Ligand binder design. Structure first.
Ligand SMILES: NC(=O)c1ccc[n+]([C@@H]2O[C@H](COP(=O)([O-])OP(=O)(O)OC[C@H]3O[C@@H](n4cnc5c(N)ncnc54)[C@H](OP(=O)(O)O)[C@@H]3O)[C@@H](O)[C@H]2O)c1
Ligand SMILES: COc1ccc2c(c1)c(CC(=O)O)c(C)n2C(=O)c1ccc(Cl)cc1
Length: 303
């Protein structure tokens, strides 16, 4: 089920992650997004950067056309890529995403990252980008607007903007038991901003971005022991951890069995001692860790 956002709309608390790397054929996103909807997912997370909005959109329209769901039962997110932070570019970028997906609106549009790129880094006052996001909500192109990859200071930037019209409903950020974002979660909760966790199953470990020496979250012994205790799986422990701390959680799978398994997160719960054991895993490990952005001026992890 769902959480009420600070603008009055509702967001399902489990979301289907749609990114797959370039070597995966583009048609696969169609197949797996249809399987997700069948399995029970109602929140679908995409982005311009994912080069899959056409296929993800066709999956959603297909499941509407066969009568499985109504458009209003689906919560679709897209994201403004970082070459489009200049405010005059924000509405056209969102209109392009809508045209690719063949939708009239997105349920949620995010600023994908604070790290602006040449429309090579760019310097852009993200307050101005945010005003343009607000106009997209006023026009009905996005029911809700939010940000992604912002740290506390960068969110405060927006919350403290003179003439602010809409707070971000959410901040979608890397978050899992090795990097659990407790303090940022407490700050988001204090401002009625939902934290949405990505790489909640430990990421896809892409060689472009992730050190292969980094520990593999789903092989963690504490998670494996809890999975045995509950006769579930390490992935389900990881997802359930997030729901119990009030985090909305995404889960990418392009495998039919695991897609179906991930919806079991609703079927069990963890005790306080389990939760404390998980919280014990925090080690400041963001799987994104590359020179390609660690040196950006708005890199979020420099705080
Ligand atoms: N805003 C941003 O900057 C940002 C960044 C990263 C991610 N995202 C969003 O968040 C989504 C999820 O994050 P993510 O892509 O890093 O991957 P993730 O959800 O952490 O998943 C990592 C891997 O877990 C595997 N998996 C899924 N279910 C499993 C299960 N039950 N058992 C064992 N393995 C399981 C999947 O492999 P299989 O496909 O082989 O199952 C997936 O590749 C993305 O697809 C995208 O929508 C956003
Ligand atoms: C661990 O997995 C990650 C981490 C970062 C990612 C992505 C995936 C994707 C892929 C996606 O969005 O699914 C994008 C576009 N990332 C960023 O641009 C990014 C770069 C640096 C920081 Cl600090 C934060 C975000």
């Amino acid at each position: 089920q769902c959480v009420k956002l600070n603008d009055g709309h509702f967001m399902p608390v489990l979301g289907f992650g749609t990114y797959a790397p370039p070597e995966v054929p583009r048609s696969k996103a169609l197949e797996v997004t249809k399987l997700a909807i069948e399995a029970g997912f109602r929140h679908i997370d995409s982005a311009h950067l994912y080069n899959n909005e056409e296929q993800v959109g066709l999956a959603i329209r297909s499941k509407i056309a066969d009568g499985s769901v109504k458009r209003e039962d689906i919560f679709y997110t897209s994201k403004l890529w970082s070459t489009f932070h200049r405010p005059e570019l924000v509405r056209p970028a969102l209109e392009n995403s809508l045209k690719k997906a063949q939708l009239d609106y997105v349920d949620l549009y995010l600023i994908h990252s604070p790290m602006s790129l040449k429309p090579i880094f760019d310097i852009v006052d993200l307050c101005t980008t945010w005003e343009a996001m607000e106009k997209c909500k006023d026009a009905g192109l996005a029911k809700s607007i939010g940000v992604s990859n912002f740290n506390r200071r960068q969110l405060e930037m927006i919350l403290n903007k003179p003439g602010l019209k809409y707070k971000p409903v959410c901040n979608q950020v890397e978050c899992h038991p090795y990097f659990n974002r407790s303090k940022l979660l407490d700050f988001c909760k204090s401002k009625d901003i939902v934290l949405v966790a990505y790489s909640a199953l430990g990421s896809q470990r892409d060689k472009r971005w992730v050190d292969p020496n980094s520990p593999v979250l789903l092989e963690d012994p504490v998670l494996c022991a809890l999975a045995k205790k509950h006769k579930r799986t390490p992935a389900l422990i990881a997802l359930r951890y997030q729901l119990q701390r009030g985090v909305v959680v995404l889960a990418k799978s392009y495998n039919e069995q695991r897609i179906r398994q991930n919806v079991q997160v609703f079927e069990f719960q963890l005790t306080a001692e389990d939760m404390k054991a998980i919280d014990g895993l925090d080690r400041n490990l963001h799987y994104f860790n590359s020179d390609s952005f660690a040196s950006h001026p708005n890199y979020p992890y420099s705080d």
